[PDB]
Each structure stands twice: as C-alpha cells, then as structure tokens.
C-alpha cells in the first residue's frame, strides 16, 4: 500500500504513457511531411494494440507462473486473478511494453503497412518482449543468474534497438535512402517529442523503484545526470564536426537516458557521469557505423537505444554501488555482477536480433512488410491513412 507510493506510481504510470505518443512526435518530425501522420499514428496504434494484448495475455506471459525459467503462464490471462497492487503493477508495466513497440517504429519509417506492423508488433510482443520481461523481472532464468536491469536497459532499450536493426535490414532501405539524404519536415515537432520523453522518463526510471523512496530519488538524479552529460557530448562532437544541431543534442541526451535506465537505481552520481560520457561516445560511433554500412535503421533506435541500452546494462556490473542500493560491481570488489550482466546482455542482444529477424521474414513472407513503391512515393499518410498532415 502506502498512499504516497501509490500516488507516485499512479503518476509514473501516466508519465510513461505519455512517452508513447512522445515517441511518435519525436520520430514524426524527422520524417517527410507526407509521412508525418503515419509516424505519429504508429505510436498511437502501438499503445492501443499493447493495452489489449497486455491485458488479454501479455501481462500473464510476462509475470505469470514461470516455466523453465523462460516464460510465464496464463494464470493472469484477461487479468484473471490480478488485484490491488498487482493491478497497478500490471498497468505501469503495460506502459513499458507500449513505449518499446513505439521506439521500434524507427526501423520502418516511411515504408511499412500498418497491418503488417500490427501483426509483426503483436508477435514481437509475444515472443521477444514478454520473454525478456519475464527473464529479468518475472523471476526468469536471467534473474536467477543474478542479472539486474533497473528500468529496462535490456528489456526495453536493447530489445527495441536490435529488433529495430533486424527489421530495418529485413524491410530494406527507403527509396533514395542512398542517392539523397531525407530531410526532417519539422524539427520543432521532434523537439516537442523530445521534451515529452525527458519529462516522462521521470516516471520511467524514477517509477521503477516502485515507491516514492530514496532509490527513486537517486534514479531521478542519475537519470538527469547521464542525460545532461551525453547531451553535452553530442553537443561537443557536433561543434567539433561543424555545428551543434539540436537533433544531435537531444539524440545525445536520449542515449544518456537509455544507458542510465538499467542502472538508474544502483549507481552514484559519479558513475552516472561516466555512464553518460561513454554512452554519448559509443552511440555516436554506432550511429556513424550504421550509417557507414548504409543500413536504413532510420531513426537510430539501434545506435541509440540498442547500443545505449547495451553499454548501460554492462556498466551496471561495473559501477553498481552497494552504498547506493546494496549491489556492487567490479569497481566495488564484485566481479560476479559484471558476469551476470555480460551473460544477460549477450543473451538478450542475440535473441532480440535473431528472433526478430525470423519474425520479420516470416511476416514478410506471409503478408509482406513494405508498401508498394508508389505508395512510398505519395507518402503513407495518404496511402495508409487516406489523410494529409498539413494544409
């Protein structure tokens, strides 16, 4: 119970929900005007399909009775037997799933069939997210190995980042991706999405303590810290490479946010500083590398969330401070934690990429992921929604 604790998590749940459309705007501003509605619409659909699957069985498969430590049962299907605290928990977690699917839409920007997205999205929820959530937070085998993930560096960031990479590769580059660079139609729209993501992350990392306590407070402090540091890094890089674009600055902060998520509740401020410092560097390099290889993993869910989540989940095993939340990492005389994290990160990264790959091809073969080239031409707002963003 604890009224303050329910108050805070009630709030945190509202805050994470906001992050879903928040992703839609963040992404929409980066795509062409002819796909603006589609990019946002996608985040909204993600929310809708997630709520339904989560209640239906998604929540159960994640936190229901464990089987072979890799998945939960159906004892909670249609929330059968979920009450009081569990209901709030079920809800808070529901929102984590939704955001994950939204981040994912990075890989299909400007060229996917909504129906295929819904289909692939529902399957990914079932065979990738639910499993991960269970492995780490539902008493799964990874939790058993002693792995940790405070707010979802793996469950959310690694999964979407790598799943997005696989999907990007499966669906193929956007027409002209190579010959010409696509221009953002509304940076301000993206910045509005960015502001909503920073604001909502308070509930994300800070709500992960499941109580208005000291852990949450620490999570909030380090979360803002890692974010500022990584934002500063991309600002210096941008300057060093020419001019400090705003897109670079917010993408830098987001990298810092993703990296700190798995560790928000275990590390101290100084650790938050290195986590963010490194995240800015690696994610940026990751972005350049993915770009160099000509992969159209469009809005860098991979380079930023995939990579940012990976480093952070690992950094947890290095910097976990017993002083902060009991746990300790290598730096604090505990080699084991690092091993558990390495194992965890290894498994989750490989699974997310390979299984997503399978799923994409499966759906692609079964129904086809991409829209016709002419639809891609006139834009998905018109072709997939029969709508027009602006007039």
């Amino acid at each position: 119970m604890s009224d303050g604790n329910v108050a805070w998590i009630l709030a945190s749940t509202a805050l994470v929900m906001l992050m879903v459309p928040g992703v839609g705007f963040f992404y929409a501003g980066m795509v062409r005007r002819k796909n603006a509605v589609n990019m946002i619409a996608l985040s909204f659909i993600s929310l809708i399909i997630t709520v339904l699957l989560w209640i239906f069985y998604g929540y159960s498969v994640s936190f229901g009775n464990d089987i072979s430590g890799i998945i939960g049962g159906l004892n909670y299907a249609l929330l059968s037997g979920v009450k009081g605290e569990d209901l709030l928990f079920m809800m808070y977690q529901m929102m984590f799933a939704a955001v994950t699917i939204a981040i994912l839409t990075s890989a299909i920007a400007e060229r996917a069939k909504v129906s295929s997205f819904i289909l692939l999205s529902a399957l990914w929820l079932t065979f990738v997210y639910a499993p991960f959530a269970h492995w780490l937070w539902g008493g799964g085998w990874l939790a058993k190995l002693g792995a940790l993930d405070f707010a979802g560096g793996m469950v959310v960031h690694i999964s979407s980042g790598f799943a997005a990479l696989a999907v990007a590769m499966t669906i193929g580059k956007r027409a002209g991706f190579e010959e010409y660079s696509i221009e953002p139609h509304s940076i301000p729209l993206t910045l509005i999405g960015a502001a909503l993501l920073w604001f909502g992350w308070f509930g994300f990392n800070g709500g992960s303590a499941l109580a208005a306590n000291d852990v949450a407070i620490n999570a909030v402090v380090v979360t803002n810290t890692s974010a500022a540091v990584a934002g500063f890094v991309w600002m210096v890089i941008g300057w060093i490479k020419g001019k400090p674009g705003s897109l670079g600055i917010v993408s830098g902060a987001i990298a810092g946010l993703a990296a700190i998520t798995p560790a928000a509740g275990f590390v101290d401020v100084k650790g938050a500083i290195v986590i963010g410092l490194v995240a800015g560097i690696v994610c940026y390099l990751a972005m350049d590398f993915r770009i160099k290889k000509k992969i159209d993993e469009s809005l860098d869910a991979w380079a930023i969330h995939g990579i940012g989540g990976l480093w952070g989940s690992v950094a947890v095993g290095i910097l976990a401070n017993p002083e902060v939340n009991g746990y300790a990492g290598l730096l604090f005389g505990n080699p084991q934690l690092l091993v558990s994290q390495l194992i965890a990160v290894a498994s989750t990264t490989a699974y997310a990429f390979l299984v997503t790959l399978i799923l994409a091809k499966a759906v692609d073969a079964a129904v086809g992921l991409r829209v016709s080239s002419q639809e891609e031409y006139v834009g998905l707002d018109l072709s997939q929604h029969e709508e027009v963003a602006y007039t």
Copy 2:
C-alpha cells in the same frame, strides 16, 4: 489528509488542467489555418473565465448548501469558508468545469464571437453545469435517487455533448459546410492535443477516487482499457470503410474514454471491454447520423462526448460490480441502479439540450452568436484576435 492522497490529487488537478488547452489543440488541428489561434484561444479563455466564476460563486452554487435538491447556496461565494481539503476539492472540480466548457467549443468552431462565447459560456456554467454538478455530486436530488457518475459521464460528457448539439443548431452551419468538406490544417497538432487528453485522463478518472487507493487504480486500468477497445473499433471501422485515419483512431479512443468516465470506479476489466466496444460502435453511428442530418455540430462533441457519456452512464447501471466498488448493476442482481441511471441520464440529457437551446437563442437575440460572413471568410484569427497563426 494523507500525504499520498493529497500528492495524488495535487497531481490529478494539474493533469485535468492540462486537458483544457489539450482540447484547444485537439480541436485546432481540425479547423482551417485561418481559425487555428481562435480554436486554441477559446480553450484558454474557457480556463480563465471558469477559474474566476468558480471561485466567485461557481464552486458554491455547485457544492454549497442544497436547496430543493437542485442547486447549492452561496455559503462558499469567493470561497468564503472553504479550507484545507475543501480547497483542494474545490480546485480539482474547478478543472472539470473548465474542460467541459472547452469540449463545448466544438459546436462553435470557426464562426462565433469570443464575447458571445464568454457570455453564453458563463451562463451555461451557471444554469447547466453548476446544477448538474450539484444534482450528482453536491448531494442533489439525482444523488438522492441513488444515481452515480464516477468521473463525469453526465456532469461533463453528456452536458457538453448535448449542449454542443443545441448550440450547433442555434448558431447555424459554417459557410460552405454543405458544398465542401472542411479540411484539417494540422493533424499533427490535433494528435498532440489527443496525446495530452489521454495523459490527463489519468488524473480525470483516476483522480476521481479522491485518494491514491484501489478505486483509483481500478479507474486507471479500466480507463485505459475502454480507450484502447474503442480506438481499436474505429480502427477496424475505418479499415472496413477504406483506410484507418489517425483522426478516426483517436476519436475512437476518446469515445471510449468518455463512456468509461462515469463508470471508471465501479466496473471490472471485462465490463470496461464491453463499455468500450459498444461506445466505439454507437458514437461512430452517432457521428454518421449527425453528419447524415447535415448538422454542423462541428467536432463531434455531441456524437462522441454526448453519446459516449450517455451510454457509459447507463452502462454503469448494468455492469457496476460490487466486487469492484461495492455497487452492483442489473447484471449483478440489481435492477434499481439501472433505473437510477436511466432517470439520471434522461433528466441530464433533456435539460442540457433544452436549457442550452434557450440560452443560445437568448444570447443570440440579446447580442448575436455568429460573426459576420466576411469575418468568417477571412478567419477568426484575424477578425476576432487580429492575429495570424503561421507565417
């Protein structure tokens, strides 16, 4: 008291406030570029005029000493004698009134005099809202008959929906409403308003428990449920009728949100599913019907809130689950609740429509509701605000 309870309601109050401009954006994106500022401006004015009337006497007339069970006294004028908890309550409720007036602006889109709006708006607050709030939440006669309305299916949705229909009919169609269909100038702007409405509804329905407790938690769960279901319905309908526009999807979710509001704290998840399922269907049919009849109830406050609120208030008498919050409906061996709801819905729907009708004509006759046709031509941003939305 209870710090957690005050914390949560403090938050819920901020969340409902956000919904007012949230309505302005939601609507603004649906009107032409020449009326964008006006559509938003209206929601802002609604907030301002409401705060002032509420404190002045609005709050008192709603929750002050009852007279003949149909209205409250002036014992709270200028909040005379309102302290501690009451102050917080007074505030939370103030925000409910504001949102109501904002939804209402649906019926006057692109052709009303701000001054007339303020006037009509202030009168509606006095003779429609305050009464309704008192009847149901201020110990009025409807409460006596045993009627219920958890978060405002009647007090807020039915009232605005039907009052909007009356006003729409009084003010007349927009020039060209018939010959040509008006196009939204910025769907993304509307989606931003939509995201703000979903997010704020957490405080709306979830804050209606007046405590960070299990009822609130249930309200939050079912609220998201009804919303997802109804959003899914309009998505299928849209697909079935062609393409799934984003406007249809969010209007579907909103229908689900309005329908669940009166019941958020009394029904279970399965009930939330039927409430949303049905809401999507009826509101959509209502929209088509209002359209068929050529009524320019512009942004479907009526079809969506009016109808969505009506069904939901009734559904309360059918699905109220004793298990959930003590109360039971027909389905749970209690025919009475249904009768109280039917009576309640009957009275509130008829009053809102007829009294609003009177008020509109009165103001129209006294000062005139509509702008000149040339002002309608150049747009109200320019003619009513001497401003220009975009450059």
Copy 3:
C-alpha cells in the same frame, strides 16, 4: 520522509523540468521561422548546462555552508555529502535554475552565439543565481533580514527579468527591430509552450511547500487565481485597445503567475486577486514602456517576469496573511515584512541588472555576444545549428 511528500515533490520536480523546454516553445513561436530551432535549442542547452553546473558546484554554492551571508561553500561540490532528502531538494532546485536561464533567452532572441550564451549563462548562474538562491533560500543575509520568497519571485523572476533587460541592452537591437515589427512564425507553437508553463507551475509554486500539505494546496489555488485574473486583465486591455490576441492573453496569465510565485504560499484568495489584477496592469504598462523606449528586450522577460516578480515580491509584504501561513504583511498589522521585502527587492533588482550588465560586456569584450549580420540574416537555425526548422 513521508511517502506522499516525496511522491508530490518527485512529481513537482518532473513538472518544473518540463517548464524549461516549455519556455523554448513559448519563445520559439514568437520568433521567425529561421530561428525557431535556435530558440528551442537554447532552452534545451540551458537545461543541460544547468544540470552539469548544479551538480558540479552550483548546488553547493547555493545551499552549502554560508560565508558572510552572501554565498555558500563547496562542501557539496559534485554533491559530495548530499543524500536522501537533500538529493531530492537538490534536484527540485536544479530545475528552478534551468527555467531561470531559459526565461533569460528572451533578451538574445534571434542574434546570439550559442557558445557565448553558454559562457554568459554559466557565469550568470555562478555570480547571480547561486548568490540569490543562497541569500533567500540558503540562509543568506536576505533571509536573515526576514525576507521571504515562496516560489521565486526574486530568485527566478526578478533575476531573469532584469538580467534580460541588461543583456538586451548590451547585445543591441535586432536588425530592423525599428523599421519593421517581427512577426511570430507559429502562434500555436507558442500556445503549446504556454500550456506547458501553466501546467508545470503546479509543481513550481505548489511544490515549493516541499510537502503535499495545506500550504501547497493554497499555493495551487492562489496560483491559478492570480493567473486567471491577470489573463483576464490583458484580455480586457486587448479588447479595449482593439482585439484580444491570444498572445496578450497568455502573456497576461504568465504575468499573474510570476507575481504570485513569491507569495503563492502566504496570501489568501482575495490577496491573489489583487496581486493578479495589479500584475496585469503594471506588466502591461512595463511592456509598453520598454517598447516606447525602443529596447529590444525581445520577448518581455523583463516587462513580465522582471516586473511581475518585483510587484509580487513586494505584494508579499503587504498581503501576507497569518491566517494562511503564519506570516503577516502591512495590511495585517505588520510593517516589518514590507520593509524586508522592499530591501530584498531593492538589492536583488539592482544586483541582477548591474552585475548582469558587467558580465555581458565582459563576455562581449572577451568573445563577442552577437552573430554576424549575415548570420542574423540567414537565421541562426542555419548559421548556428546548420539546421532548418521546417521543410
């Protein structure tokens, strides 16, 4: 401790953070399309540089051990020795600093070097904000004289308002400021920023009680009151002077918000009414005066926050109601409070203006504040960020 209290402040911190980009949007909509990204980007950078300086030493210099009652020590550098409650406090306050720097960007709209801004901004934080925060909230000499500032009428509004005036004068008018009046490129964008500022102020004033208690509740009530009153005033003025623009309406509300901030937790509703009534009048006159004198203090941080904060800080000494929060002003038989406020307002206004003036010239001489005239021509989005707002 108190879970509800931590819950509420956790929320309030997220809410104040939102206000930073909220300022960016509010301002961005008022500048030309070619500077939109820059105006927003600035608010984001403010956040980033503040978080870093605050932790680094900013927080310590403000609330660390006092020396000669005018500044704090370094006992908290890198948050050395800051834990539990202090951490939350440190965070909440961090956000106050960030917002302050953002408001400030009013004076440099459309013509400053980001690098110079960062530099000047970091120096201002150190020698103006930290001092003020310490003087009033860190047990500084002003607190000793018995001065009060509930949510920052002086620490935040007076400081930014006057510092903005000085900077405006130092950097010089925008090319063409005189011959032609600059037009807002997106009023709706500004209104989105305005809605975010009203919403976040709940955490600002309401969170300043540092507990989900009666003071917070009162702060929230009066905050909404002063805001509505001042918004109404500018609405009447606008009408009286022609048409009620939306920009005028929100600027009016903001004036009311700034004026009530220093008093949010000490006055009653009736006092909130006069504070807002007067604020609307003075700030408007201040705006006209600053305009008359041809000063390009661009987005009226001065006329609105500077002046609004000044009046409010003074009004505190006149209306403080013992009934409300123990303290009493002149009107309540206590001449002393007024004197402490007058002294406080006198010192803070003079310091902010003169020291900022020094700092501006210093940086200007050291590196130069303004961009080349050609950069000003093509716009800072392109020249300072190598980006383009819309396509």
